[PDB]
Amino acid sequence: PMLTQSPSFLSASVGDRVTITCQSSQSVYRNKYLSWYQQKPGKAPKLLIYYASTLASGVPSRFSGSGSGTEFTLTISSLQPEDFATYYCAGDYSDDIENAFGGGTKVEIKRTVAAPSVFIFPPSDEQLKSGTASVVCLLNNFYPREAKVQWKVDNALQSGNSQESVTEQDSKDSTYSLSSTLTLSKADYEKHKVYACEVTHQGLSSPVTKSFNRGE
Amino acid sequence: QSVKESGGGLFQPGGSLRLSCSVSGFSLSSYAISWVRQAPGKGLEYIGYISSIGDPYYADWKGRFTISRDSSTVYLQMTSLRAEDTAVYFCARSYPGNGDLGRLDIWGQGTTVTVSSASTKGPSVFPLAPSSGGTAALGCLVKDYFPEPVTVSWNSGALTSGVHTFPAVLQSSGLYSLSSVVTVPSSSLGTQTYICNVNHKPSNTKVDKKVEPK
Amino acid sequence: QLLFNKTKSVEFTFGNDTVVIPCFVTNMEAQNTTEVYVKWKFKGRDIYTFDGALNKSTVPTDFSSAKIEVSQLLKGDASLKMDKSDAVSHTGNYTCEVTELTREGETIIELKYRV
Ligand SMILES: *[C@@H]1O[C@H](CO)[C@@H](O)[C@H](O)[C@H]1NC(C)=O
Ligand SMILES: *[C@@H]1O[C@H](CO)[C@@H](O)[C@H](O)[C@H]1NC(C)=O
Ligand SMILES: [Ca+2]
Known part of the structure; x- marks a missing residue:
C-alpha cells in the first residue's frame, strides 16, 4: 500500500494544466478511498478531494480527481499562483495499519521572468559590539529560482564565507526571494572598506552589483 | 468545529513527548482524531488515530x-525519542468514526518538536538598516537561537504586505539564524516607525526592535 | 445519514454454536441490492464486506465463517453471523458500516462472552 506520487517537479503557466499521479501497491478500500490534500509552506494541510473525485466544500472545480483501484490522478486545470503547494494523496485499506500518504508532488507556477531587486545591509553596531559581523545581501521578488550571489571585499572574491536562504514560491505573484549572509569577525570586518554582492540572474542583462563603504 | 494542539519544543533523548489536541465545536463521540507528522523538508x-468509540x-x-x-482532548504520547522524531506534528479530524x-x-x-541533546538558546535581534528607484528594504536579523521555531511580526502585525521572512539556516556553530525583511517607500523612513516582533517560545524570548535608519 | 436500531452489546456463552451481532438500519431507501454496501470492522480490520454492486462477499481466513443474510439487506438487516470459534477468539467492539449510494452510517455493538 506504499503510495508513489509523481516525482516532485510538476509545472505549468497561469491557466495551464498540471497532472499528478498517485500509485498504490495495494488497491484502496472500495477502490475509491483516496483523498487529496494541498499544503503550502508553513500551513496545515487542506483537504481538496475525497472518495477519489468528491470535492471538499469550497474547493474550486478546477481540481479534478480521477482513477480507481491502484491508480489515481489529480488534474489541476486553470493553474494560478495560489496553487503553488505540495500535494499529497492518502489511502485507506482494509487493515488501518497500512493507511498512509504519498510522498508529495510540488507544483510550481511558471510566470514571466523577473529580475531581482538587490539590497545590501551592513552589520549593526549592536552586533559589532559582540565580535562578529553579519553582512546581508537581499534578492527580492525574482523568477525563476536560479540566482547567483558573489561576495567581494575590497574587490576580492569570497568563498566558504556565506550562507543562503530562499523563500518558497510567493502565492500572490509566484516569485522568489533570496538572502545571503556573509559572516566575518569584527577584526576582519574592520580591516576593509568596500563590501559588495554581485547578483547575476536570467532577468539581468549585466550582473548587478550593490555595495557600501564601511562608515557611510 | 476546530482543533488546537499544545506547545511542542525541545525534547532530550531521555524525555517523553506528550501532545494534546483540544477539539471544539464537535464531539469525540462522533469522529476519529488522527495524528500526522512531517520531518523538516x-x-x-x-x-495513527483513535476511533470515535x-x-x-x-x-x-x-x-x-x-x-x-478524555471527554474533549486527545493525547499523543511518545517514548524513547530519536533524532528522527523531530517533526511538525498535526492532529486532524477523521470522518468515518x-x-x-x-x-x-x-x-x-501544528507544532515543532526537536529531539536534540542541545540546550535551547534565545535569539539576538539586530536591525537591518537601509543606507542607499525610491523603494527601500529593511529588516531584522535573528541570530543564534535553538531550536526552531522563531516567529517574526512587523509593527505588531499591522504590516504584512511585502514582508519576507526567510527559512532559518543552520550555522556551523550549531545554531539557527534568519532574516525577515520588508520593503516600503524610501520617503517613509523618518515618518513611519518599523519594529520587528521576534518571539522564541522555547527560550521565553520576546524582542521588539525598532529598525531605524542610521 | 443512515440511522440504526442500536443494541449496546450482545452476550453469548459456550452453549452458543452460532453468534448473531445485530445491525438494523431504519431509513434504508434502496430498492435493489446492488446499491448497498456492508462492512464489519474489528480492531481496525474489515472482517466482513459485501459489495452489493458485485454480489461478492469477502472474509479474512480467520473469520472464515462470518456471514450476512443478503436476503434481508433491503429490509435493513445487516446482522453478522459467526461460528462459536471465530467469535470467542474475537470478542470486543464491532462496527457496522452500511452504505446505500452516498448515504452512509455506522453503529457499534460489543460482543461479550459470559463464563
Ligand atoms: C465498546 O464501546 C462502548 C462505546 O461505544 C464502550 O463504552 C465500551 O466500554 C466498549 N467496550 C470495550 C470492551 O472496549
Ligand atoms: C447465544 O445463545 C442464546 C441462547 O442460548 C441466545 O439467546 C443469544 O441470542 C445468543 N447470542 C448471540 C450473540 O448470538
Ligand atoms: Ca480501513
Missing part, C-alpha cells in the same frame, strides 16, 4: 506511540 507521515490504532512502524483521549482514511478535514496548525 520531508513528507506527511501518517501516525475511544480505541486507538497505529500505522506500520519507527516509533513507540500511545494515543488516548470507525477510523478509515476517508477524509481529514479539520486540521490543527
Whole structure:
C-alpha cells in the first residue's frame, strides 16, 4: 500500500494544466478511498478531494480527481499562483495499519521572468559590539529560482564565507526571494572598506552589483 | 468545529513527548482524531488515530506511540525519542468514526518538536538598516537561537504586505539564524516607525526592535 | 445519514454454536441490492464486506465463517453471523458500516462472552 506520487517537479503557466499521479501497491478500500490534500509552506494541510473525485466544500472545480483501484490522478486545470503547494494523496485499506500518504508532488507556477531587486545591509553596531559581523545581501521578488550571489571585499572574491536562504514560491505573484549572509569577525570586518554582492540572474542583462563603504 | 494542539519544543533523548489536541465545536463521540507528522523538508507521515468509540490504532512502524483521549482532548504520547522524531506534528479530524482514511478535514496548525541533546538558546535581534528607484528594504536579523521555531511580526502585525521572512539556516556553530525583511517607500523612513516582533517560545524570548535608519 | 436500531452489546456463552451481532438500519431507501454496501470492522480490520454492486462477499481466513443474510439487506438487516470459534477468539467492539449510494452510517455493538 506504499503510495508513489509523481516525482516532485510538476509545472505549468497561469491557466495551464498540471497532472499528478498517485500509485498504490495495494488497491484502496472500495477502490475509491483516496483523498487529496494541498499544503503550502508553513500551513496545515487542506483537504481538496475525497472518495477519489468528491470535492471538499469550497474547493474550486478546477481540481479534478480521477482513477480507481491502484491508480489515481489529480488534474489541476486553470493553474494560478495560489496553487503553488505540495500535494499529497492518502489511502485507506482494509487493515488501518497500512493507511498512509504519498510522498508529495510540488507544483510550481511558471510566470514571466523577473529580475531581482538587490539590497545590501551592513552589520549593526549592536552586533559589532559582540565580535562578529553579519553582512546581508537581499534578492527580492525574482523568477525563476536560479540566482547567483558573489561576495567581494575590497574587490576580492569570497568563498566558504556565506550562507543562503530562499523563500518558497510567493502565492500572490509566484516569485522568489533570496538572502545571503556573509559572516566575518569584527577584526576582519574592520580591516576593509568596500563590501559588495554581485547578483547575476536570467532577468539581468549585466550582473548587478550593490555595495557600501564601511562608515557611510 | 476546530482543533488546537499544545506547545511542542525541545525534547532530550531521555524525555517523553506528550501532545494534546483540544477539539471544539464537535464531539469525540462522533469522529476519529488522527495524528500526522512531517520531518523538516520531508513528507506527511501518517501516525495513527483513535476511533470515535475511544480505541486507538497505529500505522506500520519507527516509533513507540500511545494515543488516548478524555471527554474533549486527545493525547499523543511518545517514548524513547530519536533524532528522527523531530517533526511538525498535526492532529486532524477523521470522518468515518470507525477510523478509515476517508477524509481529514479539520486540521490543527501544528507544532515543532526537536529531539536534540542541545540546550535551547534565545535569539539576538539586530536591525537591518537601509543606507542607499525610491523603494527601500529593511529588516531584522535573528541570530543564534535553538531550536526552531522563531516567529517574526512587523509593527505588531499591522504590516504584512511585502514582508519576507526567510527559512532559518543552520550555522556551523550549531545554531539557527534568519532574516525577515520588508520593503516600503524610501520617503517613509523618518515618518513611519518599523519594529520587528521576534518571539522564541522555547527560550521565553520576546524582542521588539525598532529598525531605524542610521 | 443512515440511522440504526442500536443494541449496546450482545452476550453469548459456550452453549452458543452460532453468534448473531445485530445491525438494523431504519431509513434504508434502496430498492435493489446492488446499491448497498456492508462492512464489519474489528480492531481496525474489515472482517466482513459485501459489495452489493458485485454480489461478492469477502472474509479474512480467520473469520472464515462470518456471514450476512443478503436476503434481508433491503429490509435493513445487516446482522453478522459467526461460528462459536471465530467469535470467542474475537470478542470486543464491532462496527457496522452500511452504505446505500452516498448515504452512509455506522453503529457499534460489543460482543461479550459470559463464563
Ligand atoms: C465498546 O464501546 C462502548 C462505546 O461505544 C464502550 O463504552 C465500551 O466500554 C466498549 N467496550 C470495550 C470492551 O472496549
Ligand atoms: C447465544 O445463545 C442464546 C441462547 O442460548 C441466545 O439467546 C443469544 O441470542 C445468543 N447470542 C448471540 C450473540 O448470538
Ligand atoms: Ca480501513
